[PDB]
Design brief:
This protein has 256 residues and is of the alpha/beta class. The protein contains twelve helices and eight strands. The structure holds coenzyme A (COA) and chloride ion (CL). Residues 25-241 form the AB hydrolase-1 domain.
Length: 256
């Protein structure tokens, strides 16, 4: 069912995965790629970006979350025009910056396992340069509710992508919109769905209650038996929540 497509953003080749036509645009997390969203792409539809430096996209120097938001926004415009933007962790930071720069292209926001500030444990971030296996194991212990096939696969991916993982996490570590939400300057005017796995230790419940408190039209969904990787660990529950929200916002199903 899925297709891989390619577009050009200012000379940078960007790959995306796409399912059935739907105005939904997914943005993956650090050290990951569009394949993070396969369970959503096949059931809900839409497009998932491979950010530059990830998946089948070109490599290019990226020094901020804002720069990734530029690639994401251009890619959204070229594929779906306007969309519900779904971001996980780093991708949720990218989604927030995308909304702030280009609110017109966001029909709604889905903030998954993310935060207004994404400081990274120094034992992970500094541990990746010296003993990456230990750092990866620590990060993943905080990201999965259970070991098993998804955990093992992600562990191997991270071991294969340590350099990009460290670059991505360094961008997270510098990402901070917290006070701008707190002091009321940053306003999210679109419908928002905030999703977190009950066991998530990388971006815990309080990060998601923070969004829910500061965003007027937000709904919070905590998914039991999942941690940070909720869209992979509990995909059926995740999809049901997302589909209910898409109905609410009017992003119709368009079968056949
Ligand atoms: C790395 C870490 C220990 C640094 O902690 P720190 O030096 O206290 O600095 P922070 O800026 O994160 O936190 C300071 C305060 O802001 C709050 N805060 C930070 N990020 C927040 C967010 N996204 N939402 C709401 N509150 C937040 C904290 O709760 C804390 O409040 P407190 O003083 O009342 O406890 C901490 O951020 C952490 O444990 N993070 C989770 C693990 C991780 O590595 N996540 C990866 C994210 S990509
Ligand atoms: Cl991340």
């Amino acid at each position: 069912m899925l297709e891989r497509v390619f577009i050009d953003v200012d000379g940078v080749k960007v790959s995306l995965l796409k399912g059935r036509e739907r105005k939904v645009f997914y943005i993956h997390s650090s050290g990951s790629d569009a394949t993070q969203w396969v369970n959503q792409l096949t059931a809900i539809g839409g497009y998932a970006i491979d950010l530059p430096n990830h998946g089948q996209s070109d490599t290019v120097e990226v020094n901020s979350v804002d720069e990734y938001a530029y690639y994401a926004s251009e890619s959204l415009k070229k594929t779906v025009g306007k969309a519900v933007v779904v971001g996980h962790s780093l991708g949720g930071a990218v989604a927030q910056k995308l909304y702030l720069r280009n609110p017109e292209i966001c029909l709604a926001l889905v903030l998954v396992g993310t935060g207004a500030r994404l400081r990274v444990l120094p034992e992970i971030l500094e541990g990746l340069k010296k003993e990456p296996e230990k750092a990866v194991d620590l990060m993943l212990s905080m990201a999965f509710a259970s070991k098993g096939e998804e955990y093992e696969k992600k562990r191997r991916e991270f071991l294969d992508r340590v350099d990009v993982l460290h670059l991505d996490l360094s961008l997270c570590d510098r990402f901070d919109l917290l006070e701008d939400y707190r002091n009321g300057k940053l306003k999210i005017g679109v419908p928002t769905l905030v999703i977190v796995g009950e066991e998530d230790k990388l971006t815990p419940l309080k990060y998601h209650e923070f969004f829910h408190k500061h965003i007027p039209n937000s709904e919070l969904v905590v998914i039991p038996g999942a941690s940070h990787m909720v869209m992979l660990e509990k995909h059926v529950e995740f999809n049901e929540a997302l589909e209910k929200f898409l109905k609410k916002v009017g992003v119709a199903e368009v079968h056949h």
